[PDB]
């Protein structure tokens, strides 16, 4: 996880997915290994308020891929 603790859902999903060689239906287990790369701001009311973050880098190194 973001702090350092081993992410049990992630490890379980990765292991079971790797165990697809013997059973394709297990391939979906990897779904558990996805961690949303989101930094979400929340306030006292617990309702996500409109806020603007600033990052100091070019708008090319972390942007979505070209649409092709």
């Amino acid at each position: 996880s973001r702090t350092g603790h081993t992410h049990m859902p992630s490890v379980v999903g990765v292991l079971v997915f790797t165990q697809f060689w013997f059973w394709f239906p297990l391939s979906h287990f990897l779904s558990l290994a996805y961690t949303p790369t989101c930094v979400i701001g929340l306030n006292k009311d617990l309702k996500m308020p409109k806020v603007q973050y600033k990052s100091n880098c070019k708008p090319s190194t972390f942007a979505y891929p070209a649409p092709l």
């Binding site: 790369t37 989101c38 979400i40 929340l42 306030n43 006292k44 308020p49 806020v51 990052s55 972390f62």
Partner: protein, 47 residues
């Protein structure tokens, strides 16, 4: 995740991070100024 060591907010707006924008995930942005405090709409879950 590499783009977390360098991440902040402009001119320290009404919302100030509780913990620096390096751990990431979810942050309880403390509020100082009182205003309308417009929320973000709950978009429908179909795409």
């Amino acid at each position: 995740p590499a783009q977390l060591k360098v991440l902040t907010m402009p001119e320290t707006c009404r919302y100030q991070p509780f913990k620096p924008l390096s751990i990431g995930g979810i942050i309880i942005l403390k509020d100082t100024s009182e205003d309308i405090e417009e929320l973000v709409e709950p978009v429908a879950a179909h795409g």
